[PDB]
Amino acid sequence: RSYPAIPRIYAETTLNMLLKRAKKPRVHSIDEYLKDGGYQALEKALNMSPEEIIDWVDKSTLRGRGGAGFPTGKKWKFAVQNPGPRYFICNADESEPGTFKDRIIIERDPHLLIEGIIISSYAIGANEAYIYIRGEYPAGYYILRDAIEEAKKKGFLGKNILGSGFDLEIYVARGAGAYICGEETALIESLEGKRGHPRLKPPYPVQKGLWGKPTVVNNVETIANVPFIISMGWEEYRYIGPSDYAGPKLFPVSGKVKKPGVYELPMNTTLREVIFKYAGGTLGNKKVKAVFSGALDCFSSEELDIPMDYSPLGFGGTGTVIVLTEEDDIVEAALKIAEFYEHETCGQCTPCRVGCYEQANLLEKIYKGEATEQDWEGFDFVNRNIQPTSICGLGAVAGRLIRQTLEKFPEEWEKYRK
Amino acid sequence: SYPAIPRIYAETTLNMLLKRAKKPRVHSIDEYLKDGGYQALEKALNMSPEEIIDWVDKSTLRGRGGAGFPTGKKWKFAVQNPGPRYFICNADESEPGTFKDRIIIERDPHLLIEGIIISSYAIGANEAYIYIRGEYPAGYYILRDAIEEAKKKGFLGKNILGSGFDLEIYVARGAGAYICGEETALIESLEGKRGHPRLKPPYPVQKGLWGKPTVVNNVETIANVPFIISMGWEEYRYIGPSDYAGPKLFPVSGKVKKPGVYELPMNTTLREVIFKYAGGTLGNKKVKAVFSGALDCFSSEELDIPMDYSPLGFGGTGTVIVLTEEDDIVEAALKIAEFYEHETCGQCTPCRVGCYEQANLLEKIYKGEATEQDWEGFDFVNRNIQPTSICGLGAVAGRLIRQTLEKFPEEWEKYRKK
Amino acid sequence: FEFPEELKTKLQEHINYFPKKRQAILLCLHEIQNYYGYIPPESLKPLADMLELPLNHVEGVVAFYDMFDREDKAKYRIRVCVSIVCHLMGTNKLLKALENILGIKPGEVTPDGKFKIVPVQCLGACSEAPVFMVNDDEYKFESEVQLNEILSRYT
Amino acid sequence: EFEFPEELKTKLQEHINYFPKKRQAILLCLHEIQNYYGYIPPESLKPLADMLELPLNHVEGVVAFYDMFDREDKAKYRIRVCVSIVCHLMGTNKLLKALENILGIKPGEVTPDGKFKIVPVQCLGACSEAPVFMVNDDEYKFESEVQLNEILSRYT
């Protein structure tokens, strides 16, 4: 079974969990997964009550890996307080600039994700689950379809799984080019066969989701932790990394580093360690100027000693690390972030629709040296006014990184204004 | 960081094997990829092993480790025998004057690695070795690192680029024995034993490592394989004379102005190598002789020969050691005798005793301490090293020295007077 | 306008795959684009019928989702990432190489209808910047010589 | 009982696990031992034989066979001097004289501090850069006594 060409992203782990197989850049099929003890966490889970699985996942302190860090167990608990039927959704839309951590699980160790989906579905009483994978991951789509068939043949999916009385089918849906379809409610709209337009939240999907039914949406990486939590127990899982923010975490590192790729590391690792200890330091040993946390935040070279955790002073986000060095023009980089938001607003909300557009249009004039005084003042105003009335996170953050560059790199911006 | 290596001069008229290795530094995988590296492997993996064998056969590539056996034919002999099969790259390069292979290893390791992978695929070997002499520590570390890069990029390991072809390359080190360049002694050494040549036949392609079909090829031979696949066998065969086609490396040393490695077509003459490429002689002194490593001695009357594998050509490995008019031929012969004394493995009686006595007696002659019986003994010994020999060393230990006795009788006769 | 049987069969498989027919809309549109080299405007009124959806629903979905193209037929879509990391690491070198080899710029189709360059947002392979796809195949761009050889595999 | 320090033992195991069969690692292990100790200690061969699952006389025969290994003399730095044809023609004897001037020793000898041993070797495969020597893994062309003195000053 041949697949489309995929570039061979470098992957390194100090924990040997999520990347025990995915550190090798190829598809690991079900026999190889089984030889490594795979699906024995599922078997164990089916001998447990759903309520006990939720409890372990709660006690593990697992938090959402899709960017917001919501406690996973708490999320599941909320879903099961509502009458069924319920649905489970794996979010594989991964489209934020700099972020490529989820695809290496999907493309190299799909059974880790499948096993996590089955356990999670059982935990919340869902008999129908979905993977929503972005359209620009065609190989991941075919790999997952094939892996799901392998799992069916070995009796891990279908009716009455391993004699447990639990039924599950996993359907694989494809996106078709919209970053906003990673927002969980827009994702659900897309699964329902519509345009990807976020819904007002609350209600959260766990109350009202797919077809208005209780729905848990979790990120690929979040789900990939679930087999480990069942396999080793929650106590041992909490002994991974710092007691405060336990567990393995994937860090997709790119830009001006010697060893760009995905690193599996504990969350007490600092940003400086990620860059210098793990990713080989900078190209040309040039000084770090900035790190972009995807398209969300901009950290300066004075902020490299922060931990890669979900604490208030920590890196947070998805652990996406894009490294800019001393030669890299911050205004040019800010323009690329503005262009992303321009291209990805869904346009339901007026300040988001016109603000994302104007932010990019005006910043392009600034960059090219064609901005009037009014264009400069307009740019500053628009950047501060994308968020009002927004119903989803995109409008709330479309100006965030750019504002941070204005605050942290005033000298470079001032050169453009002159 | 790698151990210090002298910066051997390298020059090419063909820009193939020395396209990168003309610059005295390590070229890592990114530089190699920028030059189209590993695209030949990708092409090869879309071909049948049988077609690769056919291409290498029709290219006319001949062994570069000294004997000139047709490479495609060697592969064909291996694949007519049941597997598993092994592929060995011979990097033992220890003959006096010979330093051509190291510059590929140390400067363009990926060229060699790419060739090893293609060749292994062609013969159905899933395990390959490089056997590198112990006195090339930098080359060893460079290759170990380059193999790891190839693994990162998916050119080694299981299911290489989705082909279903598996390969690991292991790097072994020698430990001081020239005889471990003889392919059967090399295999004994890979098996953890002393480097004792085996009676052949059988040839390694019938019975080799662990008694299984094994292809041994020289570094330089293997480095041609990517070009044959990239260019096609017809275009490759267009390089140089149609009966001895392709690039050849010529390690030139001794009394020339520009000693180094020259990549040239095999219609080049020995005179051209010395005077057109290597800058002529030190002090513009007359050429007295050229030693083809420790194998042959050509006089100044023999410089118009082609640097090919023809009966009247230079042959060997194209190793060119230049002696000029004031260099004492008997002193030079003594150094050749000392080499064979040091390198006989001792299994065969005439080789064991003959290599020792040839050097022992020639030392006496050189120092003016030889009796009449020592002179007569020396002549007899020189003619009687080969009988019962099981490998090429015993067959050639007297060859160069005999040629000096025939071509420079006047100089020898001066040692007879004293 | 009528879908040929082999395509109509594949569409039916998608429609039968999910619990509700309308969930198959994106898989169907990908299939149509794969088949024709674009989304024929005339294909939408028979597709809506198969999905039991109004035509304007289907039109609205085609317009929303950036991967779909109703304007230009092309055998091979060369998707070039223009987002931050690829920009930093050499998008412009990749585009210059493509123009040197193919004679076209982003948004353009070669006169033979063989290649279209499509500028896209981050492809999720940023460590391999600058990234491009050729239809479903994805690659790191290293150099013009390397790219020329890659492109020659598409005939 | 002689035992390998843990840090050496670890490296030896890595070699033993590297190849498909344990006995293939014998030379890499012997290199590692000589690196660590400055020579091959006679007492080190049994433990190594046990680790390779080989008879001791097999290991002893291998050490005897391979010229890079030295069971006699401990030296921190091995100065390998090529004595083959091309280096001979181009100035091996000048290099040996320079080494005697700087270090007070001749081929086969160790300095009284155990720091340097001169080891005469066959062709090192750098003949265009004759006369050639190595200092442990580093390899150089000899140009002159002043140059050699500067090179040797880097090894402390």
Ligand SMILES: Cc1cc2nc3c(=O)[nH]c(=O)nc-3n(C[C@H](O)[C@H](O)[C@H](O)COP(=O)(O)O)c2cc1C
């Ligand atoms: C604009 C936008 C884009 C998002 N993209 C993704 C995405 O690609 N993948 C993802 O898992 N979550 C994404 N999210 C977050 C999801 O809405 C949601 O919080 C997440 O899928 C929940 O799973 P988790 O709790 O396991 O993180 C995005 C949110 C927004 C506002």
Ligand SMILES: Cc1cc2nc3c(=O)[nH]c(=O)nc-3n(C[C@H](O)[C@H](O)[C@H](O)COP(=O)(O)O)c2cc1C
């Ligand atoms: C004493 C002796 C030493 C040899 N040394 C080498 C050597 O260092 N490298 C080499 O590739 N072949 C060497 N050979 C030749 C090999 O036995 C063999 O022919 C060769 O590795 C086959 O590869 P080829 O066909 O690519 O030349 C030596 C042969 C003998 C007799």
Ligand code: SF4
């Ligand atoms: S905030 Fe922006 S992206 Fe989110 S729903 Fe409103 S217009 Fe759409």
Ligand code: SF4
């Ligand atoms: S001919 Fe000489 S080197 Fe070859 S096996 Fe016999 S003794 Fe050993």
Ligand code: FES
């Ligand atoms: S920025 Fe181009 S692949 Fe992510």
Ligand code: FES
């Ligand atoms: S003769 Fe000394 S390095 Fe070759």
Ligand SMILES: [Cl-]
């Ligand atoms: Cl076969």
Ligand code: NA
């Ligand atoms: Na299978």
Ligand code: NA
């Ligand atoms: Na079981």
Ligand code: NA
């Ligand atoms: Na991948």
Ligand code: NA
């Ligand atoms: Na269902």
Ligand code: NA
């Ligand atoms: Na099923």
Ligand code: NA
């Ligand atoms: Na079923």
Ligand code: NA
């Ligand atoms: Na070199």
Ligand code: NA
């Ligand atoms: Na663009």
